[PDB]
Amino acid sequence: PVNPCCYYPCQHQGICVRFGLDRYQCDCTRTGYSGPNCTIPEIWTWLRTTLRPSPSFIHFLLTHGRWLWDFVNATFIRDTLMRLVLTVRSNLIPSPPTYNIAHDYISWESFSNVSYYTRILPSVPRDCPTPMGTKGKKQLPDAEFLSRRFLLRRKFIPDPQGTNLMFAFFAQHFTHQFFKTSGKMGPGFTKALGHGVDLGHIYGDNLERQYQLRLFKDGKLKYQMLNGEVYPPSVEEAPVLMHYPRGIPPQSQMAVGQEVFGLLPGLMLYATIWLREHNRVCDLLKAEHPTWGDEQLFQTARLILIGETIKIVIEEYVQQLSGYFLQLKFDPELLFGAQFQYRNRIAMEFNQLYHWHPLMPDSFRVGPQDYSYEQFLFNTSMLVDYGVEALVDAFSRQPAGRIGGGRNIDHHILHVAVDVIKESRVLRLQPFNEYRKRFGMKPYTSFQELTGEKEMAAELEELYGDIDALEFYPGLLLEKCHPNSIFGESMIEMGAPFSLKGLLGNPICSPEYWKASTFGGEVGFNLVKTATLKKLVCLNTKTCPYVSFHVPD
Amino acid sequence: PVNPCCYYPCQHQGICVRFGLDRYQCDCTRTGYSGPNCTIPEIWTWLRTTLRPSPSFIHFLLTHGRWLWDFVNATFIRDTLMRLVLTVRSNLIPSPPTYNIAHDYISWESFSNVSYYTRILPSVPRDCPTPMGTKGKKQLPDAEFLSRRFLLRRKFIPDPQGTNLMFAFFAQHFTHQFFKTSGKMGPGFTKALGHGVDLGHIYGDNLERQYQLRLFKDGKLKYQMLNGEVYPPSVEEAPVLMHYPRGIPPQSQMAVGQEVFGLLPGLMLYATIWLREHNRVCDLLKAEHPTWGDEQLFQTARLILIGETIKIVIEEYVQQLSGYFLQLKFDPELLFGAQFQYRNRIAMEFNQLYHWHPLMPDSFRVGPQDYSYEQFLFNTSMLVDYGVEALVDAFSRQPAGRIGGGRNIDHHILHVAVDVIKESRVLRLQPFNEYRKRFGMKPYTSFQELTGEKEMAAELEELYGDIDALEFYPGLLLEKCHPNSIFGESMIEMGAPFSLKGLLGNPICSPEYWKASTFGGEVGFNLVKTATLKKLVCLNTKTCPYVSFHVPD
Ligand SMILES: *[C@@H]1O[C@H](CO)[C@@H](O[C@@H]2O[C@H](CO)[C@@H](O[C@@H]3O[C@H](CO[C@@H]4O[C@H](CO)[C@@H](O)[C@H](O)[C@@H]4O)[C@@H](O)[C@H](O)[C@@H]3O)[C@H](O)[C@H]2NC(C)=O)[C@H](O)[C@H]1NC(C)=O
Ligand SMILES: *[C@@H]1O[C@H](CO)[C@@H](O[C@@H]2O[C@H](CO)[C@@H](O[C@@H]3O[C@H](CO[C@@H]4O[C@H](CO)[C@@H](O)[C@H](O)[C@@H]4O)[C@@H](O)[C@H](O)[C@@H]3O)[C@H](O)[C@H]2NC(C)=O)[C@H](O)[C@H]1NC(C)=O
Ligand code: HEM
Ligand code: HEM
Ligand SMILES: CC[C@H](CO)NC(=O)Cc1c(C)n(C(=O)c2ccc(Cl)cc2)c2ccc(OC)cc12
Ligand SMILES: CC[C@H](CO)NC(=O)Cc1c(C)n(C(=O)c2ccc(Cl)cc2)c2ccc(OC)cc12
Ligand SMILES: *[C@@H]1O[C@H](CO)[C@@H](O[C@@H]2O[C@H](CO)[C@@H](O)[C@H](O)[C@H]2NC(C)=O)[C@H](O)[C@H]1NC(C)=O
Ligand SMILES: *[C@@H]1O[C@H](CO)[C@@H](O[C@@H]2O[C@H](CO)[C@@H](O)[C@H](O)[C@H]2NC(C)=O)[C@H](O)[C@H]1NC(C)=O
Ligand SMILES: *[C@@H]1O[C@H](CO)[C@@H](O[C@H]2O[C@H](CO)[C@@H](O)[C@H](O)[C@H]2NC(C)=O)[C@H](O)[C@H]1NC(C)=O
Ligand SMILES: *[C@@H]1O[C@H](CO)[C@@H](O[C@H]2O[C@H](CO)[C@@H](O)[C@H](O)[C@H]2NC(C)=O)[C@H](O)[C@H]1NC(C)=O
C-alpha cells in the first residue's frame, strides 16, 4: 500500500498524516489554505497571491535603482524595507524547530535533543517506490559521475561580483561554528550545540576547552609571541585537542577552539584576528571596570564579539553577497514590535547549501609567490612567516570563484561535493522541486527551465528521468544564475531565511539582552554598533593592509 | 569602598553597574523610567502608574462579583481578561533568562548552560556590610530558631478555601518535574533540564531511563499486574535507579521516572494514574494510525500528556488555588497576537516559594484507618493494598493545611523549611523588600505592616533589626493573608508570573506546534482540549471515586 505521503499531496506547508492503512489527511491549519490538500486559498491568501510579484522581479528592483536607492538609503524607507526584509524571511522557518533524522513529526525529543540537526521538510518516506517519492528512476545518478560531469571545474569561472578570498575564508570560518557534523554520532548530528553565532569556534564548544584556551587573568586568552606578533598559543600550553597532522605538535601547533582550524592558513588567520581582538576588548573593559573580575571581563567580551560578528556578517558579508543597492542594516530594535522567537536551530538543509566549495581558486597567489594546494593545505608556518597584515592583503586581492552556474568546484576538493550528494541521500532529503515549493516558489517544469541552457539539461533528464526527481544539492548548484549573481535564484531564496533567522535569532538580539549594560558600559555597545571588517583587522595589526569582501578596483 | 550596588540604587529593573572603583550607573533602558537611578517616569509610565489600581483591590474584584462574573464568564470578556491576565504577568520575567548563581550579569554561559537555575534579581554582592546589603544586623536569625518560632505548627490551621490532599500531592508531584536540585552539583543546579512541563518525572529525565521504562511495543510503558490492577513495573524489569530504602528492591519496588517517587504513596499514586493514562492514550492512537510505529505512538502520547497536564494545571489547579470567580482558561491561541517567547527556564526564587510544605496534614486519614507519618512515609505497600480508586477518594476528602499566616508547617518536615532558609542564604537572595519592588509592589515599611498582627511583628524586628533585612522565604510565609486566601499577597503576585510564563512558555503552546497533526489526528487534540482531573482518574480506574482539588461539601 504505497505510503500515500509519498506523493507529497499536502501543499503550502500542510502536514501529511496517514490514517488507517491506506488513507491520509492534511493539516492545513494556519497555512492560509483549506481543503483536502491545502489548495483552496483563503480570502487574503488569494489577494496575497495575486498582488505578489515574482522573486526574480524583486531581485531586479533591488539590483537596479542606482538613484532610487541612494534616496531610499538616505530615508527611513531603508528601515521599513529592512524590517520587512526580516520578518517575511524568518517567517518561513518553523520555531520552535520541527523534525530531525529520527522523527518526521513533532516530538518532545526533537525539541529538547540539541544533538540533532533539524529539517524543514520531512524526509522521504522510507518505503516509497522511487528513492525520491514516486517519480524518477529506481536508482539515482552515481554521485561520482554526476559530480565530475557537472560540478567538476574545467576553466575557473570567477565571481561576477568581485567576491574575493578574504571573503571565502570568513565564510568558511564563520559557518564552521554551527556546522560540525559529529563524525562519531554520524550525519544529522552536531558537536556544535548552541546553533547560533555563539562563537564556539573560538572559545571552543565545551567548558574545559574554554578553560584550556582561557588564560584566567584579566579575562584574556592564552597566546604566544612569534616575531613580536600575537598568535594562538601552542598545545604545549593549551592542552587542547586538535587535528594537526603527525608532525610537530610542539610549536607551530596552535590551539584555537575549532579543532580543525590548523589545517588551513586562512582559518588560523581569522582565529588569530579574533583572538587578538578579544584580548583587545578585554583591555578596554579592564579600564572601565577596574573592580571587575576575570569571569565577567571574559563573558562581557564574548558578548561583544557575538555582536561585532552579527554586525559585520549582516552589513558587509551579506551586503557584498547580495549585490543590493539597498544598504542592509543591523539593528535588533527593528524587530521589537514583531512576533519573533529568539532561538535558532541549525538545519541540515542549511548545512547542505552552505557548501560553497567552488569559491575556492586554482592556486593561492600571495604577492610574487603562488602556492599550489599541496603547498597550502596543512601548511603550518605560512601564517607566522608572512604576517597577518601581508596575508590579509593577499586574500583581499585574489578573486574567488563563482558558486553557481555549474562546473566550478576545483578538482581537488571535488570529493567534499560527492559526499554532500552521497550524504544527502543518507538523510533522504525530498526532491529539489519540493524544496522550491516549501520555500514559496514554483517547481521547475523541465531540466530545460532549470538550467540556463540546453546541453547540460539533456544529460540531466537522461539521468534523473524527470525534473521532479532532481536532488537538493545538485539542483542548487546547476540552477541558472541571474547575470552577475554569485549564485542562482534558489540559493538566495532558500538560504536567506535560514541565515537571517540565525543572525537575528541570537539571544543578544532580543529586547531582554540588547541593553548597554550587557556589554558593560557604553563602550561595549558602541563597539558592537560600529564594528567593521576594516576595524577588525587594522585595529589588531601593526600596518593597515587592504581588507574587504571584494577585490580592489 | 562599599560596592555601591549594595544599596540597590537602581529602581524599576534598572541594571546597576560599577564604573571605576567607587562609582556606578543604572541602565534604565526600557524600564519606562529615566535619570540616575530610574525614578523619573516617562510620560505613559506616569499615567500607567496613576491609573493603576492596587493588587489587593484587583484581588477583591476577582473574588466578589458573584453575578458580574457569571456574565463575564458567559461572554467574550472572559477571553479578553485571560489574554490580559497572561501577557501582563509573563512580561515580568526576563526572556531569554538573565542570571545564575555564577554570574550577576548577562553571559553567553548563563544563556547556554541549562544545568544552572536562573535568578530574577542579582545575588547580594559578596562584599557588602550586612548579609543582605546595608541594613540589618551583622548576622541573620538562626534558621533553626526562626523556623521553630514562626513556621512550626502548633494547632493545624486548615485552608479556608477547601483545598484538599488530593491537591497537595498533584502539586508536589507536578512541581518535582522541574525542581530537582542536583545534590551532587549542589544548590542552584538542576538534574531536571527541560525546565518546563516536559514530564521528565514520568518518562524520566535521561534517554536511557526512558528506554528503561519504555516497553518498546505500541509505544506503551512497562508495568505489572498486581490484583488485576496496572502499576509501575518493578526494577526487576525496569533496571532503573530509584531511592527506595534498603528493603525489598524486588517487588513493591517500582520504576517511575522520578527516582524519589517511591518514598510516598501519593506520588506513586499519581505516577500510576499517569502511567496508566499514557498507555491508555497509546491504545487510541494505534487504532487511528495502525501503520504508525512505536517511536511515534510514544512521542505523540508524550505530547498529549504535556497538553492534558497544562490544561488541568491551569483550568483546575490554578482555578481552585485562585478563588477567582473569573473562570480561568487554557487556549494557546490567546497569545498568538502578542510578543511571547516560547521558552521557559526555572528560577531559584520560584523553587523557593513553591515549598508548600505546610499543605501537609497532621496524620493521614484513609477511611476508618489513620496512619501517622511514621506509617505513611516510605510505606511501600499502601498503594497496591488500597487501590488507586480508594486512595484517591481518601485524599480528595482530607483538608490540606493553609500555606500562609505563619506557624503551620508540621513538626516532622519542619527541617525542609530550615533548609530552604539556610540555602536561601547560600544563594545570597536579596531581601524580601527588594523582591516586592522587582515584582511591581511597594516595600513594607515595618514588620507591623507586613504581618497581619503585632505580636510576631515584635519578635521579628528584634531579630532582623529592620524590615529591609527580612529574608525571601521567611517573609513570604509570614505575610498577612487576605481572609479565605490559601496564602498572602506576595505569594500570589510573585509566583503567578513564574507559573504562567512556564505553563504557556511550553513549545506545544506555540503557533508552530499547536496543530491537530502534532497530536496525530483530531482525537489527540480533543483529549488535550477536554482533559479534566475527573477524567484522568475515572478513565483509568474500575470504579469512579471522588476526585477534586477541594474537599467535598
Ligand atoms: C555548566 O557549568 C558548570 C559550572 O561551571 C559545569 O561544571 C563544572 O565544570 C568545570 C569545568 O568543566 C569543573 O572544573 C573544576 O575546576 C578545577 C580547576 O581546574 C584546574 O585549574 C585550571 C582550570 O582550567 C587548569 O590550569 C588546571 O589544569 C586544572 O584544570 C578542575 O581541575 C576540576 O576538574 C573541577 O571539576 C567544575 O568542577 C564543574 N562542576 C560544577 C558543576 O561546578 C558544567 O559542566 C556546565 N554544564 C554543561 C553540561 O555545560
Ligand atoms: C539525542 O538522541 C541520540 C539518538 O537517540 C542519543 O544517542 C543515542 O542514545 C541511545 C540511548 O541513550 C543509544 O542506544 C543504543 O541502543 C542499544 C540498544 O539497547 C538495547 O535494547 C534495549 C534498549 O533499551 C534494552 O532492553 C537492552 O538492555 C539494550 O539497552 C544500546 O544497547 C546501546 O547502548 C546503544 O548505544 C544510541 O546508540 C546513542 N547514540 C546515537 C547518537 O545514536 C543522545 O544521547 C541524545 N542526546 C542527548 C545528550 O540527550
Ligand atoms: C580550502 C578549501 C576547502 C577545503 C579543502 C574544504 C574541505 C572540506 C572537507 C574535507 C570537508 C569534510 C567532508 C564533507 O563533509 O564532504 C568539508 C566540509 C564542509 N565545508 Fe569545506 N572545504 C573548503 C572550503 C569551504 C568553504 C569556503 C566553505 C564555506 C562557504 C566550506 C564549508 C563547508 C561545510 C559547511 C562543510 C560541512 C561541515 C559539516 O560536516 O557539517 N568549506 N570541507
Ligand atoms: C509528605 C510531605 C512532604 C515531605 C516529607 C517533603 C520532604 C521534602 C524533603 C526531605 C526535601 C529535601 C530537602 C530540602 O530541600 O529542604 C523536599 C524538597 C522540596 N519539596 Fe517537599 N516534601 C513534602 C511535600 C511537598 C509538597 C506538597 C510540595 C509542593 C507544593 C513540596 C515541594 C518541594 C520542593 C519544591 C522542594 C525542593 C526540591 C529541590 O531540591 O529543588 N514538597 N521536600
Ligand atoms: C530583499 C529580500 C531578499 C529575499 O530573498 N533578499 C535577502 O533577504 C537578502 C539576502 C540574504 C539574507 N542572503 C544570505 O544571507 C544568504 C546566505 C547564505 C545562503 Cl546559502 C543563502 C542566502 C543573500 C544571499 C544572496 C543574495 O543575493 C544574491 C541576497 C541575500
Ligand atoms: C488576575 C491576575 C492575578 C495576578 O496576580 N492572578 C493570577 O494571575 C492568577 C493566579 C495564578 C496564575 N496563580 C498561580 O498559578 C501561582 C502558583 C504558584 C505560586 Cl508560588 C504562585 C502563584 C495563583 C495563585 C493564587 C491566586 O490567588 C489566591 C491567583 C493565582
Ligand atoms: C609552507 O609555506 C612556506 C611559506 O611560508 C613554504 O616555503 C616557501 O616556499 C617558497 C617556494 O615554494 C620559497 O620561495 C619561500 O622562500 C619559502 N619560505 C620559507 C623561507 O620557508 C613551504 O614550502 C610550505 N610547505 C609546504 C606544505 O609545501
Ligand atoms: C504500610 O501501610 C499498611 C497499609 O496498607 C500498614 O498495614 C495496615 O496497618 C493497619 C494498622 O496500622 C491495619 O489495621 C491494616 O490491616 C494493615 N494492612 C495490612 C493488612 O497490611 C502498614 O503498617 C504500613 N507500614 C508501615 C510503614 O508502618
Ligand atoms: C490531493 O492529492 C492527491 C495526491 O495525488 C490527489 O490524488 C488522488 O486523486 C487523483 C485524481 O482524483 C488521482 O490522480 C490519484 O490517483 C489519487 N491518489 C491519491 C493519493 O488518493 C487528490 O485528488 C488530491 N485531492 C484533490 C481532490 O484535489
Ligand atoms: C541614587 O541612589 C543613591 C543610593 O543611595 C543615592 O544616594 C547618594 O546620594 C544620597 C543623597 O544625595 C546620599 O544619601 C547617599 O550617601 C549617596 N550614596 C551614593 C550611592 O552615592 C543617590 O542620591 C540617588 N540619586 C539621586 C540624586 O536620586
DSSP letters of A303-347?
Answer: HHHHHHHHHHIIIIIIHHHHT-SS-----GGGGTTS--------B
Burial class (CB in 10 A: 0-12, 13-18, 19+), A283: middle
A229-231 and A33-34 beta bridge pairing:
unpaired
Enumerate residues 6+ apart whose C-beta is below 8 A from B170.
B270, B317, B533, B549
Q: What cell does B318 get?
A: 490554578
Beta bridge partners of A366: A369
Beta bridge partners of B18: B24
Residue from B12, B18, B108 to probe the interface with A (highest A Cβ count within 10 Å): B108
Longest CA span, chain A:
73
Helices (H) and strands (E) in chain A, counts: 23, 8
Distance CA A75, CA A68 (A): 11
Beta bridge partners of B221: B214
Longest CA span, chain B:
73
CB within 8 Å: A105 and B300: yes
Residue pointed to by grid coordinates 505548627: B153
Among the listed residues A533, A546, A61, the one whose alpha carbon sits nearest the alpha carbon of residue A270: A533
Contact A232, A268 (CB under 8 A): yes
Q: Which residues of A touch B111 (CB under 8 A)?
A: 507
Residue B472 CA: distances (Å) to CA of B10, B152, B181, B252, B434: 19, 17, 18, 40, 9
Binding site membership of A404 for ligand 5 (Cβ less than 6 Å):
no
Q: Which residues of A touch B336 (CB under 8 A)?
A: 339
CB within 8 Å: B512 and A96: yes
Ligand 8 center to B251 CA (angstroms)? 17
Residue pointed to by grid coordinates 521516572: B257
**Nearest ligand 2 atom, CA A112:** 50
Four-CA torsion B331, B333, B338, B343, nearest 10 degrees: 70
Facing residue for A108 by CB, picked from B27, B303, B516: B303
Distance CA B353, CA B432 (A): 12
Report the interhelical angle of B265-288 vs B294-312 (nearest 10°).
Answer: 130
Contact B418, B143 (CB under 8 A): yes
**Residue whose CB lies within 8 A of the most ligand 10 atoms, among B22, B26, B37, for a mutation test:** B37
Contact B154, B459 (CB under 8 A): no
Q: What cell does B409 get?
A: 508547617
Task: Let me know the angle formed at the C-alpha of B262 by B257 and B263, rounded to the nearest 5 degrees.
Answer: 135
The number of residues in chain B equals: 553
Within 10 angstroms of residue A121's Cβ, the number of other Cβ atoms is 21
Ligand 8 center to B374 CA (angstroms)? 11
Query: Which residues approach ligand 10 with their CB closer than 6 A?
Result: B 4, 7, 9, 36-37
Task: Give domain A43-552's CATH superfamily.
Answer: Haem peroxidase domain superfamily, animal type (1.10.640.10)
Q: Which residues of B touch A291 (CB under 8 A)?
A: 3, 18, 20-21
Among the listed residues A14, A4, A7, A8, the one whose alpha carbon sits nearest the alpha carbon of residue A40: A14
Contact A512, B95 (CB under 8 A): yes
Which helix (H) or strand (E) segment is B353 a member of? helix B348-353
Q: What cell does A436 get?
A: 522550491
In this structure, which residue's CA is closest to atom 46 in ligand 1?
B113
CA pseudo-torsion sign B217, B223, B224, B225: negative
**Residue whose CB lies within 8 A of the most ligand 10 atoms, among B2, B7, B15, for a mutation test:** B7
Ligand 1 center to A292 CA (angstroms)? 21
Amino acid B160 reads P
Three-state secondary structure call for residue B65: coil
For residue B381, which ligand has an atom nearest its CA?
8
Contact A393, A135 (CB under 8 A): no
Ligand 4 center to B173 CA (angstroms)? 10
For residue A9, which ligand has an atom nearest its CA?
9
User: Any idea what DSSP says for residue A190?
Assistant: B
The number of residues in chain A equals: 553
Contact B470, B450 (CB under 8 A): yes
Three-state secondary structure call for residue B543: coil
Among the listed residues B523, B198, B107, B27, the one whose alpha carbon sits nearest the alpha carbon of residue A293: B107
Facing residue for A103 by CB, picked from B21, B295, B340: B295
Contact A63, A325 (CB under 8 A): yes
CA pseudo-torsion sign A122, A128, A132, A134: negative
CA distance, residue A382 to nearest chain B CA (Å):
34
What CATH number does domain B2-42 carry, 2.10.25.10, 2.60.40.2230, 3.30.70.330, 3.90.180.10? Answer: 2.10.25.10
Contact B344, B499 (CB under 8 A): no
Distance CA A357, CA A317 (A): 17
DSSP letters of B392-457?
Answer: HHHHTTSB-B-SSSSS-B-SSTHHHHHHHHHHHHHHTPPPHHHHHHHTT-PPPSSHHHHTTSSHHH
Q: What cell does A328 get?
A: 542592509
Binding site membership of B413 for ligand 4 (Cβ less than 6 Å):
yes
Contact B242, B502 (CB under 8 A): no
Among the listed residues A506, A484, A209, the one whose alpha carbon sits nearest the alpha carbon of residue A330: A506
Enumerate residues 6+ apart whose C-beta is below 8 A from A51.
none
CB within 8 Å: B17 and A303: no
Q: Which residues of A touch B3 (CB under 8 A)?
A: 291
Distance CA A428, CA A188 (A): 11
Which helix (H) or strand (E) segment is B33 a member of? strand B33-34
Q: What cell does A295 get?
A: 569571569
Beta bridge partners of A15: A27
**Residue whose CB lies within 8 A of the most ligand 2 atoms, among A115, A118, A193, for a mutation test:** A115
CB pairs under 8 A between A and B: 147
Distance CA A277, CA A402 (A): 31
Distance CA A346, CA A149 (A): 31
Contact B451, B460 (CB under 8 A): yes
Contact A538, A387 (CB under 8 A): no
Q: What cell does A402 get?
A: 563563482
Distance CA B289, CA A17 (A): 9
Q: What cell does A275 get?
A: 583572538
Three-state secondary structure call for residue A24: strand
Region class of A300: left (phi > 0), else alpha (psi between -120 and 50), else beta: alpha
With DSSP H G I counted as helix, E B as strand and the rest as coil, what are the percentages for chain A, rounded to 5? 45, 10, 45
Binding site membership of A185 for ligand 3 (Cβ less than 6 Å):
no
Peptide bond connecting A97 to the previous residue in cis, omega within 30 degrees of 0: no
Q: What cell does B439 get?
A: 515584582
Enumerate residues 6+ apart whose C-beta is below 8 A from A188.
A100, A101, A116, A117, A181, A348, A427
Residue B198 CA: distances (Å) to CA of A59, A101, B303: 44, 21, 9
Distance CA A139, CA A143 (A): 11
DSSP letters of A471-532?
Answer: -HHHHHHHS---TT-SS-HHHHHHHHHHHHHHHTTSGGGSTTT-SGGGGSSHHHHHHHHH--
Within 10 angstroms of residue B229's Cβ, the number of other Cβ atoms is 17
A369-371 and B224-226 beta bridge pairing:
unpaired
Helices (H) and strands (E) in chain B, counts: 23, 8
Q: What is the resolution of this structure in A?
A: 2.8
- What residue segments make up the domains of chain A, in order of their start? 2-42, 43-552
Contact B362, B370 (CB under 8 A): no
CA distance, residue A179 to nearest chain B CA (Å):
17
Three-state secondary structure call for residue A62: helix
Distance CA B329, CA B316 (A): 9
In this structure, which residue's CA is closest to atom 2 in ligand 5?
A85
**Residue whose CB lies within 8 A of the most ligand 3 atoms, among A147, A166, A167, A172, for a mutation test:** A172
Three-state secondary structure call for residue A231: strand
Distance CA B373, CA A378 (A): 70
Distance CA B207, CA A1 (A): 33
Active-site residue set of A: 176, 354
Within 10 angstroms of residue A23's Cβ, the number of other Cβ atoms is 11
Beta bridge partners of B116: B189
Three-state secondary structure call for residue A366: strand
Burial class (CB in 10 A: 0-12, 13-18, 19+), B27: buried
Solved with: X-ray
Ligand 5 center to A62 CA (angstroms)? 12
Distance CA B142, CA B36 (A): 37
Task: Let me know the angle formed at the C-alpha of B293 by B289 and B298, rounded to the nearest 5 degrees.
Answer: 90
Give the chain A residue nearest B295 (alpha carbons).
A103
User: Any idea what DSSP says for residue B157?
Assistant: -
Within 10 angstroms of residue A67's Cβ, the number of other Cβ atoms is 9
CA pseudo-torsion sign B387, B389, B390, B395: positive
Residue pointed to by grid coordinates 522510507: A126
Distance CA B542, CA A551 (A): 79
Distance CA B351, CA B420 (A): 9
Distance CA B186, CA A434 (A): 50
With DSSP H G I counted as helix, E B as strand and the rest as coil, what are the percentages for chain B, rounded to 5? 45, 10, 45
CB within 8 Å: B288 and A19: yes
Give the chain B residue nearest A287 (alpha carbons).
B20
CB within 8 Å: B299 and A518: no
Give the chain A residue nearest B20 (alpha carbons).
A289
Among the listed residues B177, B170, B354, B190, the one whose alpha carbon sits nearest the alpha carbon of residue B257: B177
Segments in A155-254 forming alpha helices (H) = 165-175, 207-213
In this structure, which residue's CA is closest to atom 7 in ligand 9?
A9
CA distance, residue B474 to nearest chain A CA (Å):
30
Enumerate residues 6+ apart whose C-beta is below 8 A from A77.
none
CB within 8 Å: A513 and B339: no
Contact A274, A305 (CB under 8 A): yes
Phi and psi, residue A24, nearest 5°: -160, 165
CA pseudo-torsion sign A190, B188, B183, B411: negative
List b or e across A267-282, with b for residues whose CB sees 16 or more CB atoms inside 10 angstroms.
bbbbbbbbbbbbbbbb
Query: What is the rounded radius of gyration, in angstroms, for the C-alpha atoms of chain A?
Result: 24
Facing residue for A303 by CB, picked from B106, B193, B343: B106
Distance CA B239, CA B497 (A): 39
User: Any idea what DSSP says for residue B518?
Assistant: G
User: What number of CA atoms fall less than 13 Å from residue A352's CA on the CB side?
Assistant: 33
Contact B169, B398 (CB under 8 A): no
Q: How far is CA B120 from the centre of its chain?
A: 16
Distance CA A64, CA A509 (A): 31
CA pseudo-torsion sign A420, A421, A426, A430: positive
Q: What cell does B377 get?
A: 512515609
CA distance, residue A61 to nearest chain B CA (Å):
32
Facing residue for B515 by CB, picked from A29, A108, A336: A29
Distance CA A430, CA A309 (A): 33
Distance CA B438, CA B94 (A): 12
Residue B396 CA: distances (Å) to CA of A296, B169, B537: 51, 10, 12
Amino acid B428 reads R
Q: How far is CA B483 from the centre of its chain?
A: 23
Active-site residue set of B: 176, 354
Residue B465 CA: distances (Å) to CA of A418, B139, B459, B462: 75, 10, 10, 5
Distance CA A163, CA A429 (A): 30
Contact B318, B328 (CB under 8 A): yes
Phi and psi, residue B337, nearest 5°: -95, -20
Amino acid B491 reads M
Report the interhelical angle of B77-90 vs B66-74 (nearest 10°).
Answer: 100
Q: What cell does B404 get?
A: 500562609
Enumerate residues 6+ apart whose C-beta is below 8 A from B449.
none
List binding-site positions of B for heme b. Answer: 357
Distance CA B32, CA B39 (A): 9
